[PDB]
């Protein structure tokens, strides 16, 4: 583990070093954010250097027409006055900071941020051609600047800004197999239409096919005209006013009919992927650093509302059922079931690539 | 693009030696480097990625290193298995680009070539051309000069060599050298000799025939 990230303020005066950009949320514990900030050979003109980690919601404004314009609203802000060091604030260095100081000297001032564990992971919302500026959604950013006080108007070239991601990965143990079932009883009889469905497993990885086992016991006189299977991304978004959407990210419409007094068992296989979802502006993706492709967003995991973008997935299985009968076409006969599952990356061994690694 | 020049490009050592291959990249490719072993007549296999991470199922003795734009593959002690060619790959920029290869061989004790010569057959003479084949069998090292003197004359671009890979229970190469003449030319002369030079045989050996 011999390389570290660095970025300098445009005027060289300030430089930020970090051991990584992705800090894993393991539900009860988040990797702390530790690096050093290097103040230059009296390129420095300001009287104090702080570092701040901000979790922010980034959005554009629909009412306006300024391409590239976005606004960042803070959800969590922390600061350190690391230059000059403040007494009554003694802290012990990480091993990373200890190495960095040996490499650089006493003018490398450390900073450590422990992240509150109840905060949203980095999520980006799918842009459309119109969206030309920065990626909307939820992002972390470490900021280093040199100023008189925390009230000072911060020159942009006196500062450095680095995007960092807060990410989760798949759990070791899979949950119970996802099974569901529903019974519809109709008006003049008691012989039901029964829908049983199940997924082959509870945790899936991005790009991995999802096998949906469908068991229809149609004891009725109605006919199942089609069977619709869809994978749906659910997004629960909270920024004082909440919002919510469910977006089909993969979908098969089988013209598989179930006769009256019939059973029907068929496996369906769907694979969520982004390529056939590019039209869907606002679809939730794993957080971007600048503009590289990311995958459909992984499932948010939570301890047993909360701000940011909570993502989750369900298979839906819907029987489209013929009408007629006593009520003509006025009442739906349809039958549906929903199968929750987890969609995530496996825990890696090395920190995942910053950019498109074949670029 | 990115040029990835593997340095040693060929090297000899023996079971249990500590070899190191190097590969220098045109510019900073961060750690986006892989290493690959390819056995002859067989598809390349993946050894190390991210410049330093061992691929699953690869022996511990293989190790990757990085120093800025310079990358090394070291093997801490060769085994009989891992005698092959090795390429480095950068994959930080489309187009990903490999290196030229580094052949590693057995480095046994010297063994002389069993040198022979074969006239052409009746079958081939009725065809209008003549090939005469000199064979160097079971020798080390691979280097060897062969010269065809027909009437003690320099072969003026009418011969062709060909040589195997060394590996065997005995660790030696073999090499054939084929002089090809038209029956018209072949029947004119009488002395067809093959002179061989090798660092296991002092006085250059010469096999001949007249037919």
């Amino acid at each position: 583990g011999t390389r570290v990230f660095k970025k300098a303020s445009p005027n060289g005066k300030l430089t930020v070093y970090l051991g990584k950009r992705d800090f894993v949320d393991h539900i009860d514990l988040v990797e702390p954010v530790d690096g050093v900030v290097l103040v230059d050979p009296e390129y420095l003109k300001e009287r104090r250097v702080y570092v701040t980690l901000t979790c922010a919601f980034r959005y554009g404004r629909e009412d306006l027409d300024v391409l590239g314009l976005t606004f960042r609203k803070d959800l969590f802000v922390a600061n350190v006055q690391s230059f000059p060091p403040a007494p009554e604030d003694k802290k012990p260095l990480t091993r990373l900071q200890e190495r960095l100081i040996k490499k650089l000297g006493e003018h490398a001032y450390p900073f450590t941020f422990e992240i509150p564990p109840n905060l949203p992971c980095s999520v980006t919302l799918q842009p459309g051609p119109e969206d030309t500026g920065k990626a909307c959604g939820v992002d972390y950013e470490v900021k280093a600047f040199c100023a008189e006080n925390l009230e000072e108007k911060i020159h942009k070239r006196n500062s450095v800004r680095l995007v960092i991601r807060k990410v989760q990965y798949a759990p070791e143990r899979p949950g119970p197999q996802p099974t569901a079932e529903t019974t519809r009883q109709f008006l003049m009889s008691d012989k039901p239409l029964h829908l049983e469905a199940s997924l082959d497993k509870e945790i899936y990885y991005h790009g991995e096919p999802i096998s949906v086992n469908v068991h229809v016991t149609n004891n009725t006189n109605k006919t199942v005209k089609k069977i619709k299977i869809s994978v749906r991304q659910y997004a629960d978004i909270c920024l004082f006013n909440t919002a919510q959407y469910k977006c089909p990210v993969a979908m098969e419409e089988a013209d598989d009919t179930v006769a009256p007094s019939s059973t029907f068992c068929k496996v369906y296989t769907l694979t969520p992927f982004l390529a056939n979802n590019r039209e869907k502006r606002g679809l939730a993706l794993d957080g971007k650093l600048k503009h590289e492709d990311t995958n459909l967003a992984s499932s948010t995991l939570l301890r047993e509302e909360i701000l940011g973008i909570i993502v989750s997935y369900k298979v839906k299985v819907k029987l489209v059922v013929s009408r007629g009968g006593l009520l003509g076409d006025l009442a739906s006969s349809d039958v549906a079931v929903e199968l929750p599952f987890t969609l995530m990356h496996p825990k890696p061994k090395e920190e995942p690539p910053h950019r498109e690694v074949p670029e | 693009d990115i040029q990835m020049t593997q340095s040693p490009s060929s090297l000899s050592a023996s079971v249990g030696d500590r070899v190191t291959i190097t590969c220098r990249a045109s510019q900073s490719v961060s750690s986006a480097v892989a290493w690959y072993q390819q056995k002859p007549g067989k598809a390349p296999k993946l050894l190390i990625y991210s410049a330093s991470s061992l691929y699953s199922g690869v022996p511990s003795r293989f190790s990757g290193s990085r120093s800025g734009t310079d990358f090394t593959l070291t093997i801490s002690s060769l085994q009989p298995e891992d005698f092959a060619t090795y390429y480095c790959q950068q994959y930080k920029y489309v187009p990903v680009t490999f290196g030229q290869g580094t052949k590693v061989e057995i480095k046994r004790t010297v063994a002389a070539p069993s040198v022979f010569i074969f006239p052409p057959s009746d079958s081939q003479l009725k065809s209008g051309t003549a090939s005469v084949v000199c064979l160097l069998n079971n020798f080390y090292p691979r280097e060897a000069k062969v010269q065809w003197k027909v009437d003690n004359a320099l072969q003026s671009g009418n011969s062709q060599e060909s040589v195997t890979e060394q590996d065997s229970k005995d660790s030696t190469y073999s090499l054939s050298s084929t002089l090809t003449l038209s029956k018209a030319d072949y029947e004119k002369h009488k002395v067809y000799a093959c002179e061989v030079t090798h660092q296991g045989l002092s006085s250059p050996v010469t096999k001949s025939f007249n037919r």
């Binding site: 303020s9 314009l69 976005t70 606004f71 490499k103 030309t132 503009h291 | 961060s30």
Partner: peptide, 19 residues
């Protein structure tokens, strides 16, 4: 007011750290 930002500062780079 609350901060605005416009359009798509140095490049991020790396440096060596010894063990």
């Amino acid at each position: 007011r609350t901060p605005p930002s416009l359009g798509p500062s140095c490049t991020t780079a790396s440096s060596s750290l010894r063990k």
